[PDB]
C-alpha cells in the first residue's frame, strides 16, 4: 500500500536521476 | 565641501589611475589571479603551475601521443599588505583638487614601493649573470652592449622561444648605452603587439646596488645531485607540491655570503632548454638564502643531463651538463659593487593578488571600500576614520599583492665593472 | 580489510576460552554486516 | 535493466551509505570546509587558524594591548583525490542488487582508505602518550584503566575545549575492558563517557631500539607567527613541529614517543606544572642528529621569549644540555587513540567539475554529510572493452591540528 | 552638451559613492 | 557597548566593539568587574597529602 | 574561556593561599583504608569539630590526580563531578603549594591579639579594622612566603 | 556577514553560557551585591559584616 | 515543527539586538 506507493515514487525519482529526492523517500520508507 | 561618497570615489579613482600610470615594471610582470578567494587574514600558499610547452605531434592518429610531462608548481605567499597611513587634514579636503593631490601623493608612495619590491626581486633572484671588467657605453671598443649580450644569452638558452624580452636599465647605464630621453617620460616609455613581440627597453630608477661578496675559496662539499620532483610527503602524511625552483647545496663554508650574491660552478655549463646542447657560457646560479654555516640555496635547480637515475620526464627538465663534483669551486661572479641591470622573459615574474578580506559597514567607526587596479593587478582597500586627536580624518590605503619570481632561470641580471 | 571467519571444533572452542552466553549453539549472534566493517567472527562446528 | 539516471542515483546512494557506515573514526573528527575552493592545483597549503592565547590584560585603560597578538596557524595539504577507477560490465548492471553490490565494494575500499588514514595519523602523531606496564582490564589491582587515565590527562592538561573526548579501542582491548557491546551497534556506538567505541583499523606501534640517547645542546623553542620565505614574502610557520638536535637518532622512526627527563607538562590554560612528564612524538628523522617532535616544547621559565609567546607555553622547562630522551614505546602493542573535540580535522572541498560541458562522460557530484568528504562519480563508455568505465573520486585532507590533544594508549610497556 | 551632462551624472554618481559608474563615465569622457 | 551579567556566577560585565583603521579590523572588548574576597579564612581549608618530611 | 580562566585561577589561588584549616597526612589520597588518606572525611571532621559550618554542607575541591586516586566513578557525573540534571568536585586550576624552607622559627615575644571593631585614620574619622589578619613578630622570617 | 545586533546578541549569549558552564569554583562562592551601586570607576572598599558572636 | 519557527524568532531577536529574548527563546528551543 503506502510502501508500494513510496517505492514507485523513489523508482521514478531514480529514473529521473534526482538523487536528493530518492534519498529523502528512502529515509521516509525506513 | 566634499561628502563621504565623493571622498571615496575621488580617492579610489586617483589611486587606480596613478598606480596604473606610474609602475612600468609591474606591467611587464604577468598578473596571476588565484582561483580561490579567501576570507582569512593569512593568505594560503598559492601553488600555481609552471608550464613548459609539449612538442607538437603531427598525424591523424594520436592514440600513442602519451608523454605526460612532469607537472611542477611554484609557491607564492602573500605578505602583509603594503599600506600608506596618513592624516586627511582640513586643507586636503577644501576642494576636489587638494584631495586629488593628496591621494595622488599616497598612490605615488605605494607605486614606488611596488616597483622597489619588483626590482629587488629581479636583482636578488635573477640567475643569468653576465659580467666583464668593462663598463656600459656606446663605443664598441671598450664597452658593453648589454642588450646584445642579454639577447644572445637568451637565444642560446632558448628560454624565450616566441615572446619578447623586457630589458631594464638604471638611469646611469641607460644614459651610457645611448638611449635618449627626448620625447620620453621618466621611465623611457613613449607617450602613446600584445600577441607577440613587444620587446622594449625601459629605464627604472629603482634598481638596487649589488654588494660584492667577501668570500673566497669556498668549495662544494660532497657530491650533490638534484632531480625535479612534483610531490613530497609533509609531516601530516599528505602530499604537498615541491618548489623545484630552489635547491640546497652543501659547501665548505658560507662565510661572507648573503642573499644577493651570484655563483657559477667551474665545471658546470648551461644547456639549451629545447635541445640540451652544451653551451660555452659558464652556468650561473644565484643564491636566495644561507641556511646554515654549511648549506646554501640557489635560484636555478642544477639538474645534470648525465644522470642515470633521472627519468626521461625528469630529463626534460635539464639545465646542467654535469652535477656538482666532490671539490668544485663556487667561483663567485659579483666581485665589485655595481648598480644592476635586470632583464627577464615573458613569464619570468608574476604578480599575484586577491581582494583583501574585510567586512564593510559593520563597524560604524570606519568606512572601508575595496578597490582593484586591473591594469597592474593589485587589489587593495581604502579606509577612512575620524580622529578626535587631530580634529580631522585618518585615511589608509592598503595594497595586498605578492610578487613571485617564477622561472628564475629566465630572469637575467647584468652588472658591469667586475674588474677583479 | 574485512572480517575473517574462524571455525573451531567444539573442544578447542571451549579450551580457547569462548563463551556461549547470548549466542546460539554455534557461537553466532542470535540476530553492512560485521564482516564488512572488518570484525572477525569466531564460531564452532562439530 | 538499468537506465542511466538509476545508475547514477543508485551509485551515489550506495557510496554514501557504505562510507558513512564503516567509518566510525572519521565521523568523530571535526569537519572543516575552507572558503578557498581551489581547482585542481592540489588545492593549496590551506593555512588554518589556531585558538589564541593572550596575557591577562587587566585595567580600565588599555591603549595598545591589542597589537601584540601572535595569530598562529597550521597547514593542511589536500593533495590528490583518492580514486577507484574500474569497469562496469553487463553482469553488474543486469539488476539493482548486483550494481549496488559492485558500488558497495568500491565505496568500502574508499572508506577503508579514509579509516586507515585517520587511524595511522592519530597513532603516529598523537602526543598525549599514556603507558602502563599492565594490560587493559577491569580488575583494579593488576589491570589498567585506559579511559580513566586518558580522561584525567585531558582534564589536567585543560586541552578539552568542552565538547567531550573520543576514545577508540582496538577490538581486543575493547573486549578486555568491561563493555557490553550487545545493546550498542557494531562499533560500540549508541544508535568515562559514552564516546568509547572500537575500531579495527587501529595500527600497531612497533618498538623503538633507541637507547642511551640525549639532547645534543640547549635548545629553546618559541612560537613564531610568520617567517620570510625564499621570495621575501611572509609565509606562516607551522608551530606544531619543532626540530630538536639529539646525540644520535638511531632506531628512531615516525611513530616513536619520547619524553625528555626533568620536563613536565603545564596546564594549557592555567599554566601550572603537572606531575606527568611531557611526552612528545617524533614525526621525522631529518638527519643522524635531528628529529621533529610533534608538540613544540615552549618553556614557561624561558626569559628569551615575550609574554605573548609565553602565553603558548606547555612545558615546565626548556631542554637542557644533556637531558635523557626516555623512549616510551618499549614493547610492541596495538594502540588505543583518544582525542579532544578539535584534535583532528578532515578538510574537503567539492571536486571542481564542469558538468555537461564535455559530452561523453556523465559526472555527478556527491557529498557525504556524516563524514566531511566530497566526491565525484563519473561514467564513460569504452568501445574497446564494450563496457562502461566508472570512477569514484574522494577529495579530502585529514589534518592532525593540535597534536597535543591526540593521545595514544600503550599497554604492556613492561620494559 | 554631452560633456556637461556627463559631468552632472558623474557628480550625481560620486555623491552616492558608486565608483564603477564614475569610472565608466570617466572612460566615456576620454 | 553592551552591558551583560552572568547570573550563575554573579559577575557583571560589558561587551564593546569599535572599528580601528590601524588594524583594518573591529576591536572587541569584554570586561568582567569582580572582586573575590576570602571572608572567614578560618573556614577555608587546604588539604596537603604526602607530607612525609 | 580566558575570562573564566582568570576567575577560577583567582578563586583557587585565594583559597589555597588564604585557607587556614590545614590538614596534612604522610600518606597519599586513596581508597585504601590501611595506607591511604581520606581527605573528605578529615575535612568534614575538622569543620564539624570546629563548628565553622553553618549546617549547610561544605564544598570539597580535588585536583584531578587526587580525584582519580580517591576512586570517584565520574561516569554518572558532569566533567567536574556535579551530578548534572557530599558535593565533591575536581578542578584543574588548583595550585601546587611549594614547600617552606624555614626551620628555626620561634615567636619573638609574648603577643596577644584582640578583635578591634574600629580605628582612627589620619583624617580623624573612624574606620573599621579588618579582623582577619594578625601581625606576629617572629625571631626570623627567612624562607617564609605568602 | 553578521549584522551589528546579531554580533552583540551572539557574543553576549556565548559569553554568558560558557562562563557559567566552565566555572565550578566561582559558582560555589557566595554572590555579594554591594548595596551602594553607583556610576563611579574608583574601586570602593566594601565592608561586609561578619556574623556577630 | 515549531522548532523551526522559534528558530526564526531567535534569528529575528538576534538581528534586532535583544539578548534577553534571544536567550529565553533559546532556552525554549532546547
Numbering used by the authors:
A (entry chain L), E (entry chain N), I (entry chain J): 271 to 300
B (entry chain G): 2 to 193, 203 to 430
C (entry chain F): 163 to 193, 201 to 215
D (entry chain A): 2 to 192, 207 to 430
F (entry chain B): 378 to 430
G (entry chain B): 109 to 193, 209 to 269
H (entry chain B): 2 to 54
Text from the published report:
Salmonella typhimurium bacteriophage P22, a member of Podoviridae, is an established model system for studying protein assembly and conformational changes in macromolecular machines under different functional states. Approximately 250–300 copies of scaffolding protein gp8 and 415 copies of coat protein gp5 bind to each other to form the procapsid in the T = 7 laevo icosahedral arrangement. In addition to the conserved HK97 fold, gp5 has a distinctive nonconserved domain (insertion domain or I-domain) that is inserted in the A-domain. Here, we report the cryo-electron microscopy structures of procapsid, empty procapsid, empty mature capsid, and mature capsid of phage P22 at resolutions of 2.6 Å, 3.9 Å, 2.8 Å, and 3.0 Å, respectively.
There are seven subunits of the coat protein gp5 in the procapsid asymmetric unit, that is, six for the hexon and one for the penton. We built atomic models for the seven gp5 subunits based on our 2.6 Å resolution density map of the procapsid. The gp5 structure can be divided into six domains, namely, the N-arm (residues 2–30), P-domain (residues 31–33, 79–127, and 358–416), insertion (I-, residues 222–345), A-domain (residues 128–221, 346–357, and 417–430), E-loop (residues 51–78), and F-loop (residues 34–50). The gp5 subunits in the procapsid are closely linked to each other through electrostatic interactions. We identified the inter-subunit salt bridges between E81 and K249 in the two neighboring gp5 subunits, respectively, and between D246 and R255 in the two neighboring gp5 subunits, respectively. In our structure, W48 was located in the F-loop, where it formed a hydrogen bond with T46 in the neighboring gp5 subunit, which is consistent with the results of a previous biochemical study that reported the mutation W48Q to decrease the stability of the procapsid shell. There were U-shaped structures of a helix-turn-helix motif anchored on the inner surface of the procapsid around the icosahedral fivefold axes and local sixfold axes. The quality of the U-shaped structure was further improved by the asymmetric averaging of the seven U-shaped structures in the asymmetric unit, allowing us to build an atomic model of the C-terminal residues (271–300) of the 303-residue scaffolding protein gp8 into the U-shaped structure. The C-terminus of gp8 in the asymmetric unit was anchored to the inner capsid through electrostatic interactions mediated by R293 and K296 in the helix-loop-helix of gp8 and D14, E15, and E18 in the gp5 N-arm domain. In addition, S285 in gp8 formed a hydrogen-bond interaction with N4 in gp5, and Y292 in gp8 formed a cationic π interaction with R101 in gp5; these interactions further stabilized the scaffolding protein in the capsid.
